[PDB]
Design a protein around this ligand. Structure first.
Ligand code: SF4
Ligand code: SF4
Ligand code: F3S
Ligand SMILES: [Mg+2]
Lengths: 267, 534
């Protein structure tokens, strides 16, 4: 599926909504066709690969056991309750699949708040015992680079992969194992509404003239002050981001944000 | 050479989510089928007790392929529960983002999920690009030259000669395959358009972020309307309009012509993958409280009787669990829904999926583009009729041909073309409404302590409904009934096969090691397993 030449990537889907895979398809300069034809070798990816069934399982084994090595990109949390049965692929639990494959990777990237921290299915009461990759697989010494967000900015995945290929090492990581080059600043310190925040100029409701005028969304729940991400800087789809669309940040690159940041419209 | 015995396809790739298909084959034709969804997350359990305003943020994470659709369904549901009538502009903006979602979703489905079932990418290397260019130029107003297609061929050649086939590794067409019919030149045209569609979809998705903050997972809806005051500006409207215009041109000039050339080459596929019953909820309202105000109207059809479309009665929905991994066997209306997981392994106690089995008046119902198109057609929808009739005339087939795998694939394109034109109509109405001096986008509302609500979306895969019971101002019950749950859920307690199971009966399988015919039918429903199970 690979050999020499382009670095092999094995992309795994655990408990996920496929929003992170879709985010990668929005890659811009480089675009996803350049990434899959020129930069990397995408050797397993259930959303877009041609093979299915046994043929797909074969492609995966071929990629994972390659003497050339592979990088694993992991989307989705790992359900661990009831011995992992809430999530299976090819009738193997996702916990077993990841336990077997990820220790063999040259590097692992957890892409997605679900993969990094457990995500939406880990929110209380977590019926499937979902865990982020490093939590689930700590005992196997897996230390994935965490690229958080729901979904993350694909700029952040490509930037991390390019760095890794250049330098042969992870970039500086924060205490949640996220690259500081992307997660080093709060959304809030980068926000265009910060002068209103400083002045105590808050929109009291979404229908208000203050909201129309672009006042700060803190009283409507904005979690920008407690969220690390590069959203106001890079934006999404080369054009917008939540506060510039008038809606508070919901904290989506932070661990446990479904429970920590809720109710989303209170601070 | 004909095979008798089981075939298992696990994972089914080029879908969203985790699906296991099991069939029994006899003498080369499918005799029995099971649709097994193998991931559960339990979002309905997680929502209990929470603030109803928070539901749309959680339920949007049901699915990032059909992103936005669940935020819209939950927001419609909570809007309904609290009795708010959102401003006209909120309806326009929500509707426009949804139309843009359909275009993005269907273009990526045809090229990036479905087409590798029908296109041999490696045979494109043998093509004559000059011949190919003539063919491409004869099916579209867009002129393609030999040089254009040679660039694609040269890029592919370099990719293939590297030995690293990537996403094409072990593809069912490698080495040739008797069920793959296209000539090298048509393979080359489709492959060129596959690649082009990877960059076009960026633009299609960007249209949603212009008003909706970001894609995937938009962030502009609230109970009572939308938040995006910038969406009123001429600059943002123009930016949207330019992306829409480019997206529509790709639909009209690239996707539909490709769809017709492939369909003409696989006309035998009018003989497989039919279904009996159809349900659709309608979409693109003028009045948030009246489904019959939608540009596509709701309806129900049993046993292909399109002369007798039945009204949609939302109280006739029940979700079965007898063949699902939940407690017991009792079917429930979603305002009395239960989500009580209990795993028994594959076929343990005759249960084999994490999806519930929705039934309408006890019947299994196909939903999605074929339901929306056939029901609209039969309602006299003039745009759906004009496009459907042209497609059938081009293909030289009768309407009966639509009841098939090919027909459903064609219906996905028909709906894409119709919605792409209708987005322009909605955009003009939106512009006209602003010009009248209406700049309001959100209305005030109050949370009741006790209420019931339901929100209906016809999503790219069909009829989506979110159902809430509010108790003490919190979520007492929240149930999602999702289009893939209808189409790909398992059998019910009357043991009736679901639409996907039933549609697979009679599928020919030329080569059991490479069962592309099963994939063609399964993919034609555009399965979304994160959606179906949640
Ligand atoms: S991080 Fe968010 S977008 Fe990504 S798989 Fe999880 S729920 Fe979906
Ligand atoms: S809108 Fe949010 S991120 Fe911006 S200044 Fe206010 S609290 Fe900070
Ligand atoms: S919700 Fe997420 S996408 Fe950015 S603005 Fe807040 S971290
Ligand atoms: Mg449900």
């Amino acid at each position: 599926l690979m050999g020499p030449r382009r670095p092999s990537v094995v992309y795994l889907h655990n408990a996920e909504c496929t929003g992170c895979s879709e985010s990668v398809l929005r890659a811009f300069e480089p675009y996803i066709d350049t990434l899959i034809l020129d930069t990397l070798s995408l050797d397993y990816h259930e959303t877009i690969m041609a093979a299915a069934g046994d043929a797909a399982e074969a492609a995966l084994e071929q990629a994972v056991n390659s003497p050339h090595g592979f990088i694993a990109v992991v989307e989705g949390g790992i359900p661990t309750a009831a011995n992992g049965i809430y999530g299976k692929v090819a009738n193997h639990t996702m916990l077993d699949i990841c336990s077997r494959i990820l220790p063999k990777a040259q590097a692992v990237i957890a892409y997605g708040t679900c993969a990094t921290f457990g995500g939406v299915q880990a929110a209380k009461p977590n019926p499937t015992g979902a865990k982020g990759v490093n939590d689930a697989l700590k005992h196997l010494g897996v230390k994935a680079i965490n690229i958080a967000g729901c979904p993350p900015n694909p700029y952040n995945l490509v930037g991390t992969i390019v760095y890794y290929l250049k330098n042969k090492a992870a970039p500086e990581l924060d205490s949640l194992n996220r690259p500081t080059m992307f997660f080093g600043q709060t959304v809030h310190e980068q926000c265009p509404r910060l002068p209103h925040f400083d002045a105590g100029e808050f929109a009291p409701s979404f229908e208000s003239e203050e909201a129309r005028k672009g006042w700060c969304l803190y009283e409507l729940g904005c979690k920008g002050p407690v969220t690390m991400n590069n959203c106001p800087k890079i934006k999404f789809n080369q054009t917008n981001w939540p506060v510039d669309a008038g809606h508070p940040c919901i904290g989506c690159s932070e661990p446990d944000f479904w429970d920590a940041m809720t109710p989303f419209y209170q601070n | 050479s004909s095979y008798s015995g089981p075939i298992v396809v696990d994972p089914v790739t080029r879908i969203e989510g985790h699906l296991r298909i099991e069939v029994e084959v006899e003498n080369g034709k499918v005799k029995n089928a099971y649709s097994s969804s193998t991931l559960f997350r339990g979002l309905e359990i997680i929502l209990k007790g929470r603030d109803p305003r928070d539901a749309q943020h959680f339920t949007q994470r049901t699915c990032g392929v059909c992103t936005y659709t669940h935020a819209l369904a939950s927001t419609r549901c909570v809007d309904n529960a609290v009795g708010v009538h959102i401003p006209k502009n909120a309806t326009y903006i929500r509707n426009l983002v949804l139309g843009a979602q359909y275009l993005h979703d269907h273009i990526v489905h045809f090229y990036h999920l479905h087409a590798l079932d029908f296109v041999d990418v490696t045979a494109a290397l043998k093509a004559d690009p000059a011949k190919a260019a003539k063919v491409a130029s004869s099916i579209s107003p867009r002129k393609t030259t030999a040089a254009d297609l040679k660039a694609v061929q040269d890029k592919l050649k370099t990719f293939v000669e590297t030995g690293q086939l990537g996403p094409f590794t072990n593809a069912y067409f490698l080495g040739g395959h008797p069920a793959y019919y296209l000539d090298p030149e048509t393979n080359l045209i489709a492959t060129a358009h596959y690649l082009e569609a990877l960059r076009l979809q960026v633009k299609a998705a960007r249209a949603m972020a212009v008003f909706g903050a970001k894609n995937p997972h938009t962030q502009f809806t609230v109970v009572g309307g939308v938040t995006c005051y910038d969406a009123l500006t001429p600059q943002r409207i123009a930016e949207f309009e330019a992306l829409w215009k480019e997206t529509k041109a790709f639909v009209d000039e690239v996707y539909i012509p490709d769809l017709l050339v492939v369909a003409a080459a696989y006309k035998d596929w009018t003989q497989y993958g039919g279904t009996d019953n159809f349900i659709t909820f309608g979409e693109f309202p003028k009045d948030e409280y009246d489904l019959n105000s939608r540009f596509f109207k709701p309806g129900v059809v049993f046993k292909r009787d399109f002369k007798n479309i039945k009204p949609f009665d939302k109280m006739q929905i029940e979700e079965h669990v007898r063949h699902s991994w939940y407690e017991g066997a009792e079917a429930r209306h979603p305002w009395k829904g239960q989500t009580q997981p209990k795993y028994t392994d594959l076929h343990g106690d005759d249960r084999y999926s994490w999806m519930k089995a929705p039934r309408y008046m006890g019947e299994p119902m196909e939903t999605g583009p074929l339901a929306q198109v056939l029901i609209a057609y039969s309602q006299g929808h003039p745009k759906v009729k004009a496009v459907t009739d042209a497609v059938l005339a081009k293909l030289g087939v009768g309407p009966e041909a639509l009841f098939s795998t090919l027909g459903r694939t064609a219906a996905r394109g028909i709906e894409t073309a119709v919605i792409a034109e209708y987005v322009g109509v909605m955009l003009q109405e939106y512009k006209d409404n602003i010009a009248k001096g209406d700049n309001v986008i959100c209305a005030p509302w109050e949370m009741p302590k006790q209420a019931e609500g339901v929100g209906f979306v016809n999503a790219p895969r069909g009829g989506l409904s979110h159902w809430i019971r509010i108790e003490d101002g919190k979520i007492g019950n929240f149930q999602l009934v999702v289009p893939s749950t209808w189409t790909l859920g398992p059998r019910c307690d009357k043991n009736k096969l679901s639409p996907v199971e039933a549609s697979l009966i009679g599928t020919p399988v030329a080569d059991a090691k490479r069962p592309v015919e099963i994939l063609r039918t399964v993919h034609s429903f555009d399965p979304c397993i994160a959606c179906g199970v949640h």
